[PDB]
Design a binder for these strands. Structure first.
Lengths: 429, 54, 53, 54, 54
DNA sequence: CAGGCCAAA
DNA sequence: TCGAA
DNA sequence: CAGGCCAAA
DNA sequence: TCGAA
DNA sequence: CAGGCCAAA
DNA sequence: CAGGCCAAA
DNA sequence: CAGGCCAAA
């Protein structure tokens, strides 16, 4: 029999977008030295071991998309980041012909140059590491002598301004010609740092294990043979990266009496849980279901995380485990692999009278060409005939919140805890 | 220009040509995420052949 | 079909000015549009002033 | 020679959308009759011939 | 610079013609990209920055 | 990948 | 076709 | 040799 | 399977 | 070898 | 085109 | 046999 109607279902429009950037980065070949970091609050006294492996911030949205693209993206509710890709090529590595010292005839045409690549060091459970900005000595510019006070947020903000420039009405407009326009090189300042405990003032039983042998977890190549070659190629598929919240549904409490109904979940976990661990071992690991949560669209929505533009440069793109959907969901913890690349410090051609590492270095600089692609997807659903887009309420989203109203998000800036990236309260910009 | 006959005329322009060398940053450290603020002297050498027929 | 063009780095979408559009207007400020409701004139659909809803 | 930059041009995103409807219409089989329409302003007096073609 | 001065010029020796010598000439005209300066603009400002000319 | 626009061909 | 195919 | 541990696969 | 095979 | 120019096609 | 969501498969 | 005329194509 002829069918005059068939179940065609909803009209839903899906939109895929792609964002590409090309960056050229300059890195300094820092010496590996030990710096003391004094105790401060809950931070214990510790030793820090510096490197020249600059952090590549491929985990953040500004790395892939301009302020104009970001501003336009807010007009597409339900936008999810789907995949991110990065390719790193190295160019010729420059090493100074001589050092500043005049007493030694240290100039030499012969060079030994080495390129260092570290993938996924951030997640190694027994290596405590972060990316830090150093201060350097005036006589030895390759030698860190302390820590800059710049935060990770401020570092990424400065990188973003270098990439995309100021507003046309800024008094400081001329200070940063946008590399997205010129294609000029940008200096990176955030370097992989390895920590270990400082037991000088420790009372009772001391842990005297020294350092982890972190060189056993990096790749090091002859830089003379890597000119104009790819050294890193990484692809990442996001688990849950909601960049713009979904369209709100038509609220069923306006239509139904049973809007606050209950139903079986069986043995399935449909509400996520928060895991807390304690490496001091004063308390055992705990798992708590039904964390404080807020809807991010709809009647009582709290959109602070998206209103504050946290996901542009302050927090990583991947946020799996931080958000919930009201359906029968399966959620796991997430983290993107870290990327650090750089040039090993080049010792100055001179004699020393002891069996030690070098104490003076030649100026050396890495030149890295970075390609990056980000793909996203958004939806325009029409559940109802009038009044714009509305999604099914099974698409409704929630976000972890703290009791003071601050949204909670994943952060990659702190060292891993049991190989995990912690989630912390966001800070208002 | 016009000619008095039954003419067909459109707007014109020749394509522009610009060539050069990108600035070469000086080998030095700076303490911020910016472009270079000091450069090495660098110079492009271009050999140009040109033919015009009339 | 619609387009999101990015001619500039900041401040949202901007198109090339060769995409700029104009519409016929009457002297009283009413936009002019085609209408199909009137009979054809020499086989043509006339354009008339729009009326405010 | 290896090209570090190529003219990729602008980023432009194109979006195609489709709209479907199904309608069922009832029409009346009108008689073809002649109605007089009186003159009004610039409208001249005329005869009108009706149809059932909706 | 290409073709030199007249033989009676007081400045004749200053520019030996490159059409005769084949020597190199320095160019001084460079591509420049403009954008609006909204520091003193009143009302609605256009804050789009620069076009990505690279 | 240039010549009266490019997101058209 | 006052490019020119 | 990267993504919720690696000494598991 | 909120990577994905 | 002519018809909106011929030195254009 | 139905059974714990569909815009997922 | 419809879309800037049809008795033109």
């Amino acid at each position: 029999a002829t069918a005059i109607l068939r179940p065609i279902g909803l009209h839903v429009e899906k939109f895929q977008q792609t964002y590409r950037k090309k960056w050229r980065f300059l890195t300094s070949a820092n010496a590996n030295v030990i710096l003391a970091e004094a105790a401060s609050g809950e931070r214990p006294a510790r030793w820090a071991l510096t490197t020249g492996m600059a952090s590549i911030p491929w985990e953040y949205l500004f790395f892939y998309m301009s302020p104009a693209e970001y501003n336009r993206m807010k007009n597409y509710p339900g936008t999810f980041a789907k995949s991110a890709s990065v390719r790193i090529r190295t160019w010729n590595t420059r090493v100074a012909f001589q050092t500043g010292d005049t007493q030694t005839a240290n100039a030499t045409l012969n060079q030994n140059k080495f390129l260092q690549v570290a993938k996924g060091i951030r997640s190694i459970p027994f290596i405590c590491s972060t990316n830090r900005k150093y201060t350097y000595s005036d006589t030895e510019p390759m030698q860190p002598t302390g820590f800059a006070t710049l935060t990770s947020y401020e570092y990424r903000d400065g990188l973003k301004i270098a990439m995309y420039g100021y507003d046309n009405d800024s008094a400081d407009f001329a200070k940063k010609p946008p590399a997205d326009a010129t294609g000029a090189e940008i200096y990176l300042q955030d370097y992989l740092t390895i920590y270990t405990n400082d037991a000088r003032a420790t009372t009772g039983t001391k842990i005297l294990a020294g350092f982890p042998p972190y060189k056993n977890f990096i790749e090091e190549f002859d830089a003379s043979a890597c000119i104009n070659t790819d050294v890193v190629a990484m692809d990442y598929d996001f688990s849950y990266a909601p960049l713009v919240p979904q369209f709100a549904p038509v609220p069923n409490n306006l239509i139904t009496q049973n809007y606050n109904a209950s139903y079986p979940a069986g043995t399935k976990n449909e509400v996520t849980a928060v895991k807390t661990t304690d490496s001091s071992q004063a308390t055992p690991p705990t798992q708590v279901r039904n964390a404080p949560r807020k809807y991010i669209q709809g009647p009582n929505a709290d959109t602070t995380f998206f209103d504050e533009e946290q996901n542009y440069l302050r927090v990583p793109i991947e946020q799996g485990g931080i958000f919930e959907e009201v359906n029968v969901e399966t959620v796991h913890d997430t983290q993107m692999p870290s990327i650090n690349v750089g040039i090993r410090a080049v010792p100055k051609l001179t004699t020393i009278d002891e069996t030690t590492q070098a104490n003076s270095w030649l100026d050396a600089q890495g030149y890295f060409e970075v390609d990056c692609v980000l793909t996203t997807e958004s939806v325009d659903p029409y559940t109802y005939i009038k009044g714009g887009c509305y999604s099914a309420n099974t698409k409704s989203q929630l976000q972890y919140f703290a009791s003071d109203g601050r949204p909670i998000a994943k952060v990659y800036d702190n060292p891993n805890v049991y190989g995990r990236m912690q989630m912390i309260k966001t800070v208002k910009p």
